[PDB]
Amino acid sequence: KASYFINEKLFTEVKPVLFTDLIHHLKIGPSMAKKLMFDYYKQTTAKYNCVVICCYKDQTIKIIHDLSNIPQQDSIIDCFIYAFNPFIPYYDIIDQKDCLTIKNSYELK
Amino acid sequence: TKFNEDRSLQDENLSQPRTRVRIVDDNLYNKSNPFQLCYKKRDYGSQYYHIYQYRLKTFRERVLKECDKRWDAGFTLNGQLVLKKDKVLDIQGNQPCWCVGSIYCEMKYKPNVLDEVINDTYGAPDLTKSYTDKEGGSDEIMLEDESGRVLLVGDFIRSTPFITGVVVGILGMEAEAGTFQVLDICYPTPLPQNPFPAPIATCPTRGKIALVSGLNLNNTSPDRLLRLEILREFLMGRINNKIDDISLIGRLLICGNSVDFDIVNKDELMISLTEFSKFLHNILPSISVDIMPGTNDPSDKSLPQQPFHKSLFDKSLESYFNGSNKEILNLVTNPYEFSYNGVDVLAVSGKNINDICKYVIPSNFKDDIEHRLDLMECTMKWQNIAPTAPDTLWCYPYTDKDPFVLDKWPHVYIVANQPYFGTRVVEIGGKNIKIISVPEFSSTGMIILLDLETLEAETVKID
Amino acid sequence: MLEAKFEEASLFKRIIDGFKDCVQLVNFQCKEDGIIAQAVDDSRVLLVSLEIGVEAFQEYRCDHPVTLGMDLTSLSKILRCGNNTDTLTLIADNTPDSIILLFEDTKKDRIAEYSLKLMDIDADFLKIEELQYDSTLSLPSSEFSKIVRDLSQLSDSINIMITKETIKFVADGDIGSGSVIIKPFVDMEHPETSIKLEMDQPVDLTFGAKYLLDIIKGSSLSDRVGIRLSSEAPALFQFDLKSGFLQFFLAPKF
Amino acid sequence: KINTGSQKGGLMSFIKKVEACKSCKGPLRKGEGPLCSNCLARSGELYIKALYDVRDLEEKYSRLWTQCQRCAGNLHSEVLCSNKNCDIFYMRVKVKKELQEKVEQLSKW
Ligand code: SF4
Ligand SMILES: [Zn+2]
């Protein structure tokens, strides 16, 4: 898969790469994109500032910065690895075709 | 977190290829809207006394439908049988007088435009954290009425909020021939409330709705757009491990205060509108949104804020703005009455409740943690959502018809832009309704999944 | 970009001086078929309306309808700086901050490039609600101007009586009175001296002389003036142009 | 700013307003709408200007008339006040008229 290559294109370019940029590029599901970013952080580590978002029971989706991870280590049911930054010009308009885990219930006529 | 995410980052990812169709929950709009007020046929030559005439008339009728019950001809106070004499000016003796009329508060810190025109300080910003003195007791409460105004004094007025514009039946005694000792009050008769057909739905889960308010996007952007993007992804079914739990969010409601700029020269506002249009175009292909204007949104300042205009959004949204396509985007007025498959919902930007809090909560006893829920409960005890409609929170000078007065109690009542989150079910004569206080998304990232099945306002905080 | 090259600066100078006194700030609408500008005086009883079709000009490069906030005193000052052998051209860019006026002499000589600042008078563009006038008379303009002058010398309220096919002006002042009774005239030798009344409706109207004294100033452009009168509709004085008009709309005082 | 509004008299009556284009005053507004096809790119700014003018005017109108009611002491009665020495006198009617005109101008979109 071109993940390792198409991520680096967003790394020669200083602009950060979202975890949704993987869905925009390779047209893969969110869970696979998260696995890709995780393995890239595991064994494919230039130098970059990392930010993770840990879910909770109260759905307290918080951006874990400064790597504290003190509050409720056990109450965290999931934690994705968020965008890679060395914020971002937000909503680089995507057509969202075939990039939807959940499609809309309507027609757009 | 390097090992905290280790065990977490091994997923099944088996339901990825297919597109998970969301739920279908619309709202009935073809009927009417009491708050729709086109700019054409908008007469401004009238005066604000027609609103009070209509209020007094209809509220006096509704309360007289129930004043005879507790204040009949045989009701005694051990001093003398209670008297029915209206025209509040004619309190001539110590007999217990009960009468109906519009409450009017007279504080000393209420913004008086005439003083500003005198001092030539009009147009300047205002701190006006509160109106009540609360340290000198200079504020008064007069039972204003057609040909009459009598001050009220005593201890009963220290419990009830007693906000101006409300029309309730006051029974008391004449104290100093100009004052009035409020002994008790009576509220209007209970309104009808449509049933709640919860279990009849063919689908087992009638779905939820997402409530988020106080976006107030601005060029300063202290991570205000980061929370917005996280919320977009969360509603997009990515941040959650969906087991058909985030696929039951359906509609999404944004109630007022979407943009923000310190009014300069309409440039930062354009960037905020561009960011909002980007968010809408990026979230609409999956979710269906309907936006309520606010007092800071690019819409009217009077309370019945007409809906947004298409000229505020980019071209992709304009494509979505095709006719006969309101199921995707709606752009309702500020106070709107949805019907999410039988769940009659009433939502307001929250300016009315904040203005009411200006009438009780003082600046530099009643604090504001749950007393705001009590203020909404009072607003529902009365039958108008804007008691201070003409006088304090400026509105259109309606004539012969007021949309702020209620005609039926809604199953849900949402108040946006509140400093805190809280929900409460209140029952007034069998018809019990849910009242939710959705906070500002900018300060605290809390959004509210309001369930339509059984009205459980769950919270989802984003930090 | 507007580029209206005239044929002679005296034409535009007279066009402006015809109504530079009654009104003072106008909006010239350089559209795709010439120039049109209407305005109302402060007394709100006189409405000037000028239309110069593209035929009167020599060149017209205006491709987008532009507006020029002309102040008539400054523009008259600029036009007084023109010769009688120059082809004045008005140039304006896309978004006009100023207007360029070039009185380039036909023979190779000193070109006169003036840059006049523009304003935004933010006024409304008006138009008369037309109606079949009771009498559309034509009369040599010099005679009408002389009549208005010598009558206004007496009083400050001139009256017109269009009855039984004889145009009549009367003025009753303090020092006396003056009554001019001109018959409907027609001749083949002098076409300017032509007066053909209309017996559609008898008209007895009185106008303020303080406005006719300004009407008669645009008497040099048109050799003859067309006065349309109606007992209810406001009177019109049309000074015809080569491809337009400089018509005034006046209402009888009441 | 030449007002020429609500001055119906000897000549200011039975006169038209051709409703030229906005921000360019182009008389070639045969095509309906508050803007001509030439300067249609500014359709998002002129609406903002008109709407904010209407906002200021309606706020001022409400403040002035509600203030008049507070001064008159009466709320359910009509305030027919002849006091011409009040700073708000001569101003409430002006703001009413101006807000009427600006709202009628906003109703063209
Ligand atoms: S204009 Fe002056 S006198 Fe009249 S109601 Fe208003 S404040 Fe009172
Ligand atoms: Zn234009």
Residue B412: C-alpha distances to residues B72, B287, B354 (Å) = 34, 22, 19
Beta bridge partners of B439: B418
CB nearest A64 (choices: B1, B223, B237): B1
C to A contact (≥3 Cβ pairs closer than 8 Å): no
* Residue among B257, B349, B354 at smallest CA distance from B303: B349
> Which candidate, C64, C6, C40, C27, places its Cα nearest to that of C248?
C40
With contact defined as beta carbons under 8 Å apart, do C68 and C92 qualify? yes
* Tokens found for residue C251: 């209402």
**Residue B122 Cα distances to C189, D63, D86, angstroms:** 73, 11, 15
- Sign of CA pseudo-dihedral D25, D31, D37, D42: positive
Q: What is the DSSP letter of D41?
A: G
Candidates C2, C29, C206: best to mutate against D (most CBs of D within 10 A) is: C29
Count of domains forming chain C:
1
φ/ψ of residue C193, rounded to 5: -75, 75
Q: CB-based contacts of D10: which residues, under 8 Å, 6+ apart?
A: C44, C45, C234, C251, C252, C253, C254
With the C-alpha atoms ordered A18, A19, A21, A22, is the resulting torsion angle positive or negative?
positive
**Placement of tokens 């977190």 in the chain:** B1
Closest CA to B211 of B20, B437, B454, B462: B437
Q: What is the CA radius of gyration of chain C?
A: 20
Beta carbons within 10 angstroms of residue B12's beta carbon: 8
Q: At what angle do helices B371-381 and B351-358 cross, to 10 degrees?
A: 110
Q: Confirm if B223 and B6 have CB atoms less than 8 A apart.
A: no
b/e map of C63-95 (b: 16 or more CB within 10 Å)? ebbbbbbbbbeebbebbeebeeebbbbbbbeee
Count structural domains, chain A. Answer: 1
Token pair of A11 as six digits: 């790394």
Task: For residue C48, give both structure tokens.
Answer: 């000037």
For residues C40 and D9, what is the distance between their CA atoms, to the nearest angstrom? 13
Rounded Cα–Cα distance for residues C144 and C219 (Å): 9
Residue position matching structure tokens 């000589």: C109
Under 8 Å CB-to-CB from D31, ≥6 apart: which residues?
D37
Sheet containing strand C46-53, strands side by side: C66-71, C25-31, C34-40, C46-53, C244-250, C235-239, C224-229, C135-140
In D, which residues are within 8 Å of C250 by CB distance? 11
The pair of structure tokens assigned to D24 is 């360019």
Task: Report the neighbours of B using a cutoff of 3 or more CB pairs below 8 angstroms.
Answer: A, D
Any CB–CB contact under 8 A between D6 and chain C? no
Nearest CA residue ID for atom 4, ligand 1: D81
Look at residues C139, C201, C132 and name the one whose alpha carbon lies nearest to residue C164.
C201
What residues form DSSP beta bridges with C58? none
Chain B residues with CB-CB distance to D70 below 8 A: 112, 391
In this complex, the residue of B19, B275, B328 whose CB is nearest that of residue A108 is: B328
DSSP-derived secondary structure letter, B251: E
Of B44, B52, B112, the CB nearest to D103: B44
Whether D21 contacts chain C with CB within 8 A? yes
Q: How far apart are CA B344 and CA B329, in angstroms?
A: 19
Q: Does B271 touch chain A (CB under 8 A)?
A: no
Picking from B255, B169, B180, the residue whose alpha carbon sits closest to that of residue B210 is: B255
Residue at D45: amino acid letter: E
| Contact between chain B and chain C (3 or more Cβ pairs less than 8 Å apart) | no
Phi–psi pair at C171, nearest 5 degrees: -150, 125
With tokens 């680089």, the residue in question is A92
Are B258 and B294 spatial neighbours (Cβ–Cβ below 8 Å)? Answer: yes
Q: Is C219 in contact with C145 (CB distance < 8 Å)?
A: yes
CA proximity to B47, closest of C176, D75, C204, C102? D75
In chain B, CATH 2.40.50.430 sits at 48-186
Do residues B52 and D78 lie in contact, with contact meaning Cβ atoms separated by under 8 Å? no
Three-class SS state of B293: coil
Query: Chain A interface residues facing chain B, Cβ-Cβ under 8 Å?
Result: 20, 28-32, 34-35, 38, 52-55, 58-64, 67, 69, 73, 76-81, 87, 90-91, 93-94, 96, 100-109
Give the span between the Cα atoms of B320 and A108, in whole angstroms.
7
Residue C9 burial by Cβ neighbours in a 10 Å radius (0-12, 13-18, 19+): buried
SS3 content of chain A, % helix, strand, coil (to 5): 25, 20, 55
Cα B198 to Cα B114, B253, B338: the distances in Å are 53, 21, 16
Resolution of the coordinates, Å: 3.2
Q: What's the token pair of residue B282?
A: 């990026």
Q: How far is it, in rounded angstroms, from Cα B357 to Cα D57?
A: 26
Map residue B54 onto helix, strand or coil.
Answer: helix
Burial class (CB in 10 A: 0-12, 13-18, 19+), A82: buried
CB B67 within 8 A of CB B100: yes
The answer to whether A84 and A11 are in contact (CB under 8 A) is yes
CB atoms within 10 A of CB A71: 12
Nearest-angstrom CA–CA distance, C41 and C228: 20
Q: Is B256 helix (H, G, I), strand (E, B) or coil?
A: coil
Measuring CA to CA, which residue among B358, B405, B361 is closest to residue B379? B405
Tokens representing residue B61 in the block: 């009728």
Q: Using alpha carbons, select from B201, B199, B287 the residue that is nearest to residue B238.
A: B287
> What's the one-letter identity of residue C23?
V
Instruction: Give the whole-angstrom CA distance, residue C212 versus residue C208.
Output: 7
CA distance B404 to B387: 8
Distance CA C185, CA C181 (A): 12
Tell me which CATH code domain B3-42+193-460 carries. Answer: 3.60.21.50
**Cα–chain center distance at B341:** 21
DSSP string, C3-63: EEE-S-HHHHHHHHHTTTTT--EEEEEEETTEEEEEEE-TTSSEEEEEEEETTTSSEE---
Which three-class secondary structure state does DSSP give residue B271? helix
User: In whole angstroms, what is the distance from residue B68 CA to residue B120 CA?
Assistant: 51
CB C192 within 8 A of CB C111: no
Structurally, what CATH architecture does the domain formed by B48-186 represent? Beta Barrel (2.40)
At D13, list the tokens.
């009556």
> Pairing state of beta strands C157-163 and C166-172?
antiparallel
DSSP three-state, residue B140:
strand
Query: Which technique was the structure solved with, according to the deposited record?
Result: cryo-EM
For the record, the structure tokens of D57 come out as 């005017």
Which tokens go with D94?
A: 């002006």
Q: Output the CA B297–ligand 2 centroid distance in Å.
A: 27
Could you tell me the sign of the dihedral formed by the alpha carbons of C59, C61, C63, C64, in that order? negative
- Which of residues 107 through 146 in chain C touch D, CB cutoff 8 A? 121-129
Ligand 2 center to D25 CA (angstroms): 6
Separation of alpha carbons B316 and A95, rounded Å: 10
Which candidate in C38, C124, C130 is best for mutational testing of the D interface (most D CBs within 10 A)?
Answer: C124
Residue whose C-alpha is closest to residue B93's, from B101, B107, B103, B83:
B83
> Is the CB of residue C217 less than 8 Å from the CB of residue C187?
no
Dist. CA B174–CA B185, nearest whole Å: 15
Helix (H, G, I), strand (E, B) or coil at C186: coil
Q: Are D78 and B49 in contact (CB under 8 A)?
A: yes
Query: Is it the case that chain D and chain C have 3 or more CB pairs lying under 8 Å apart?
Result: yes
